[PDB]
Design a protein around this nucleic acid. Structure first.
Ligand code: MG
Ligand code: ZN
Lengths: 162, 52, 55, 111, 234, 45, 392
RNA sequence: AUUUUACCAAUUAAGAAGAAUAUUAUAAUAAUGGGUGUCUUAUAUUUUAAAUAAAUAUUUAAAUUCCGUGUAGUAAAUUUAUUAU
RNA sequence: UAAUAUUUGUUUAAUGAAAAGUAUUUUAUUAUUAUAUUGUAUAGUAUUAUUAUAGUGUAUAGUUUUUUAAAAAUAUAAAAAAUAAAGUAUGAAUUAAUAUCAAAAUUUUAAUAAAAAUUAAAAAAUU
């Protein structure tokens, strides 16, 4: 009676966002690359997702003891049948793993370590380097001091994160 | 192997795993199988053409 | 129900005193002089100071 | 198509990494060739409209948006997948709006 | 002018035409008359009042209940101008340029792109810069010269991009009121630079342990070498 | 059949909650309103 | 029949002979799959229906692939770790450069001005702190950068520390090296204890007492001079008094006292130690010992303005079962707002802690009250445990 | 003062290897019943029969329960013919 | 509809169990008097359903998951008695053309007429 709550009209009506035709977002070629949350006014310091593993116990510290959840160690359907993945993770697999395809290795393969090579397109365009190593089955090349990024080597018993 | 190559920098020539592209279906095909010889095929590829 | 209720009928229930007394109501409290926890007067804690003198 | 621009579609979908190799770069047809210029954004300056380099313009926009959100004297916490309903949680929220942190925590503790 | 693009913002937001959206204009929110359906008559001041002032507050607006940004501080604006400098010109690049033209063509365009953009956003911030010289601080008065230097731009006191006006004929130019566009930039940057020199000497006259000793050694040293790069003395 | 959905879809802002939210309801409301006022204007006012 | 969709997610009534579906216990929904099915994902290994093929690749790449590093590499990595001397130099330098450019707070009239946030300052300081080995208050830092005096002390103490670390060696690294394979506090370390005390002093003005007490621990960690030790122990006595750490105050109160022979005559420290020891004794309600201690202070130190104050305040003030029950100061009220037992949660009836695992209050290993599981235990088929006839 | 009356509002550009050896028709050259994690044995592993069919045909006439039924070699082994990762 | 119904785990004689045709026993396990080989625990009815079907064989293993601080009416038993309704948590289903609603009366209109017109006098919430 001292607080003030008027019912928000969004819970009454929640139409789904319009889906894209052929994944073509009609205005990519017009508008900027600014994140829409930023221009909308949405910002956050921490995003704490309770579906993460670490946060799991407080996820179970916020619920009621009265609500039971069955099938904790067993499953009604037998899980040892081979049945396929849902489709978008199949797509993740395919996009990540392309070199499993037949004949993905390039025919009479030219690039061998020690050759001096220009970068034709993308970042580092116009840079000459020497081929250090060849990863052949991926069709990939390591070129000397081109595309140099950080590698995180995690902490352990004796070492810090490098 | 990806991680290890990224670290050590060694070049890798052959794939560390064997890929059966038939997903275990090539064992279904009889062992003496070979494709027949096809004559006068439709295509432009046997004409080596670099510029068109 | 014989018909879908619009947002107004859904909003009519919040004008009621039953709703306000149940849901949006602030509790009156002070600091327990023994425990320094927020406390409603008339409800005490299991601690041997707070049983005899119940502050 | 007698000239296939790379960002366009033929028997395809919008596969954006494949469609545009470089987001900063812009592809157009000139003298019957694929010719590739630097992308510009049109921005009003002195009352004419001036062309600025698109990439650094955009990354600068998001830079200043993040920094004007950051150096502000507030902390915004987003908690996701809270195990309550929408209606119930909205009800339980509406009590706490516009309170001190002290009274917020106390009113949360006492219900 | 409320919702879309503020006074000191870097967006060019066209309020009347919606170019950023993913959907056709279904429901027009501010509407006065039922004749707004087929002929909204937007573009009239009195109806775009009603439309633009009914838009939701953006990240730029920071609507009433939400706390807004301290923008007009000179101490924000100068590092803002400075972070523009590291955008176009990389550190490595900067070094090579510091030395002393032999430079990758590709690379060259980045320098002139830096100059271009810096010109633009100086044009945007100066209506907020001219407000704030008064309470501006000794470090960030100097930052005005540091940031112009790092972006490789020489400030007009009478390479430099800030001296010329962008060409267009005065009949064709956009004179519409309410849009803050200063038509003489090189005339009002020049008298911004002169002003911010004149204020600096005020605070160095105002400023007269080893911390203050080393500080007063160093920043006094930085004055003549930074103002000297733009050709200004004292 | 032409019911004039695509013009009247722009007016909804002048309707209260149930009509301004959901499309068809609002369009029925606006069709009704404008036909009514048209009739009235021609014969009565 | 079928007042809803033909999906196995859809809302309304279905029928088995028309829309047959098999038994899906918890079927993850149309959007996000929620915290319940994810609970199942992180405990039993898959979703409860057994139709969702467990696919964890995306975290295998996150945890196990990232830690792979081979022996031949990781036998060489620690030969390349950065030089800590240089790192201390760089950290001190850019931390100081970043602090020096912090804008002076503009003083408004009629309303308090919001201080400019220290966003850019967290980045240099977090490198500096664990290059140094001491965690520093952000709050205390901001409060120090509020006051011009505190900012002055902080700045020139940082400058002195900088200069001493460049020209001299790093003394804690010296005495870390000479330890595993004794001397008075060096120049740089004096600078360091001075600036840490400054920042704790600032930490107190904003009313973070626990943190101000925690900062000074490392501050005594870096002081080998008995004058420094006396002053620091005194300071921690007071900073643990405000925090209502009474065993901490009545610990650190008396070392500051113990140093009185070998501390110079020019010190206020030992008297402060007396004051803290006495005050801690007073807050625990032992007044007799408090007056005994202030009596000792005025015995040894004759007249002392703080011991004046505390002798006359004790004088003005003038059962074992009820002692240290009372809540006398607000910081433990603040600490009681958190960490307290409320209605319905964080009490002894919700979830109980056992060996760092959560339990329902039904299995409460320290409690057999009614409804508890251990009441149902029986006699386990050996000997009759109790003479109870009916139950157990 | 213990307290700023009750009521009254929307409609969102989308952050991203979370859409390709993708769906459908199209190839007139192969084809004893495809079955991988398979692997003695065959007393117990038989599918044949002159018809409208995994073979599918270039006109409006005549004539027939008067009223639902109708076109004959195009070339004789000639090029309308069951194709295919 | 729905701040709804349902659920709600504070005290066990379900002794036994071949007929179940699903459930990673990491080595479940002889010491045998016997030979090789093979195989031992919870899913019938869409459920961890009301609660199984049947053949063993036996009688003192208590053989150890059922919330709650008034009264109507419903259900049992003796209008008294026993049981259940403000509750924290979970959260369905029938229904849905509707505008903030439609209260009372009178006549009329092609068959109740919540359709007309006129007079009129229906506040909000909860049961
Ligand atoms: Mg998608
Ligand atoms: Zn208490």
């Amino acid at each position: 009676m001292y607080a003030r709550f008027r019912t928000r009209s969004k819970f009454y009506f929640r139409p789904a966002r319009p889906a894209l035709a052929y994944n073509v977002d009609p205005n990519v070629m017009r508008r900027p690359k600014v994140k829409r949350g930023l221009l909308k006014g949405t910002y956050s310091d921490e995003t704490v997702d309770l579906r993460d593993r670490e946060r799991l116990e407080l996820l179970e510290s916020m619920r009621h003891p009265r609500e039971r959840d069955f099938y904790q160690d067993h499953t009604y359907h037998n899980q040892w049948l081979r049945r396929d993945l849902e489709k978008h993770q199949k797509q993740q697999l395919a996009a990540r793993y392309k070199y499993f395809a037949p004949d993905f290795e390039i025919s009479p393969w030219i690039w061998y370590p020690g050759d001096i090579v220009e970068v034709v397109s993308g970042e580092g365009i116009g840079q000459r380097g020497t081929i250090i190593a060849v990863i052949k089955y991926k069709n990939e090349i390591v070129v000397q001091n081109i595309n140099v990024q950080d590698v995180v080597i995690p902490a352990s018993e004796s070492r810090p994160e490098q | 192997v990806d991680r290890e190559v990224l670290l050590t920098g060694k070049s890798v020539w052959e794939c560390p795993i064997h890929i059966d592209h038939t997903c275990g279906g090539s064992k279904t095909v009889p062992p003496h199988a070979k494709k027949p010889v096809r004559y006068m095929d439709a295509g432009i590829a046997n004409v080596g053409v670099t510029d068109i | 129900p014989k018909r879908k209720k619009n947002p107004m009928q859904l909003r009519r229930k919040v004008y009621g005193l039953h709703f306000k007394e149940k849901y949006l109501k602030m509790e009156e409290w002070y600091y327990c002089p023994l425990c320094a926890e927020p406390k409603k007067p008339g409800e005490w804690c299991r601690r041997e100071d707070c049983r005899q003198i119940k502050p | 198509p007698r000239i296939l621009l790379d960002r366009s579609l033929w028997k395809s979908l919008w596969i954006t990494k494949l469609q545009l190799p470089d987001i900063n770069r812009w592809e157009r047809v000139v003298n019957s060739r694929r010719v590739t210029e630097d992308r510009y954004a049109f921005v009003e300056e002195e009352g004419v409209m001036h062309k600025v380099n698109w990439g650094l313009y955009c990354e600068r926009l998001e830079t200043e948006l993040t920094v004007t959100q950051e150096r502000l004297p507030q902390h915004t916490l987003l908690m996701k997948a809270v195990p309550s309903s929408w209606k119930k949680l909205d009800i339980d929220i509406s009590v706490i709006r516009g309170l001190s942190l002290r009274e917020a925590m106390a009113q949360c503790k006492l219900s | 002018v409320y919702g879309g693009s503020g006074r000191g913002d870097l967006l060019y937001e066209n309020p009347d035409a919606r170019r950023h959206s993913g959907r056709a204009l279904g429901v027009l929110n501010g509407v006065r008359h039922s004749s707004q359906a087929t002929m909204p008559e937007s573009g009239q001041l009195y109806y775009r009042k009603l439309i633009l002032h009914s838009r939701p507050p953006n990240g730029s607006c920071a609507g009433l209940q939400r706390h807004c940004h301290d923008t007009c501080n000179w101490s924000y604006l100068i590092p803002s101008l400075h972070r523009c400098a590291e955008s176009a010109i990389s550190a490595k690049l900067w070094e090579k340029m510091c030395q002393l033209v032999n430079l990758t063509q590709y690379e060259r365009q980045r320098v002139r792109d830096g100059q271009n953009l810096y010109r633009y956003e100086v044009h945007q911030r100066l209506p907020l810069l001219e407000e704030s010289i008064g309470w501006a601080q000794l470090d960030d008065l100097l930052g005005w010269f540091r940031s112009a230097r790092r972006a490789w731009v020489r400030l007009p006191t009478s390479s430099s991009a800030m001296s010329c006006r962008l060409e267009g004929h005065a009949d064709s130019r956009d004179t519409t009121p309410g849009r803050n566009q200063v038509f003489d930039t090189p005339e009002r940057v020049e008298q911004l630079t002169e002003a911010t020199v004149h204020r600096i000497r005020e605070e160095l006259q105002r400023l007269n342990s080893a911390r203050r000793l080393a500080r007063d050694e160093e920043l006094s040293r930085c004055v003549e070498e930074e103002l000297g790069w733009h050709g200004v003395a004292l | 059949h032409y019911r004039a959905k695509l013009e009247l879809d722009r007016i909804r802002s002048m309707l209260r909650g149930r009509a301004r939210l959901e499309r068809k309801v609002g369009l029925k409301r606006l069709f009704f309103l404008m036909r009514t006022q048209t009739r009235y204007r021609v014969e009565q006012q | 029949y079928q007042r809803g969709g033909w999906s196995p997610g859809s809302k309304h009534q279905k029928h088995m002979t028309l829309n047959p579906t098999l038994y899906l216990y918890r079927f993850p929904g149309p959007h996000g799959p929620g915290p319940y099915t994810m609970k199942y994902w992180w405990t039993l290994g898959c979703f409860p229906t057994g139709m969702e093929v467990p696919f964890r690749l995306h975290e295998f790449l996150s945890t196990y692939q990232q830690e792979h590093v081979p022996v031949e590499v990781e036998e060489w990595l620690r030969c390349y770790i950065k030089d800590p001397l240089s790192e201390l130099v760089n950290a001190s330098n850019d931390f100081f450069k970043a602090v020096e450019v912090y804008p002076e707070v503009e003083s408004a009239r009629g309303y308090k001005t919001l201080q400019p946030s220290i966003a850019p300052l967290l980045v240099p300081m977090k490198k500096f702190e664990e290059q140094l080995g001491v965690k520093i208050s952000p709050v205390g830092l901001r409060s120090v950068l509020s006051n011009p005096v505190l900012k002055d002390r902080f700045l020139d103490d940082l400058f002195d520390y900088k200069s001493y670390v460049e020209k001299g060696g790093s003394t804690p690294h010296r005495r870390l090296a000479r330890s595993r394979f004794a001397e008075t506090t060096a120049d740089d370390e004096r600078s360091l204890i001075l600036l840490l005390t400054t920042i704790s002093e600032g930490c107190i003005n904003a009313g973070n007492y626990s943190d101000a007490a925690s900062v000074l621990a490392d501050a005594l960690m870096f002081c080998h001079d008995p004058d420094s030790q006396a002053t620091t122990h005194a300071n921690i006595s007071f900073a643990s008094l405000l925090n209502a750490d009474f065993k901490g105050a009545e610990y650190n109160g008396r070392e500051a006292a113990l140093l009185q022979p070998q501390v110079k005559p020019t010190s206020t420290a030992c008297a402060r130690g007396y004051v803290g020891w006495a005050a801690a004794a007073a807050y625990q309600d032992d007044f007799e010992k408090a007056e005994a201690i202030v009596k000792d202070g005025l015995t040894l130190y004759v007249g002392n303005e703080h011991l004046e104050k505390l002798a006359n305040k004790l004088q003005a003030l003038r059962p074992r079962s009820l002692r240290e029950s009372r809540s006398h100061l607000p910081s433990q009220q603040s600490r009681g707002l958190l960490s307290g037992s409320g209605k319905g949660f964080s009490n002894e009836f919700d979830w109980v802690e056992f060996k760092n695992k959560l339990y329902p209050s039904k299995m409460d290993p320290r409690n057999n009250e009614m409804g508890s599981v251990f009441r149902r235990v029986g006699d386990l088929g050996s000997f009759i445990s109790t003479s109870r006839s009916m139950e157990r």
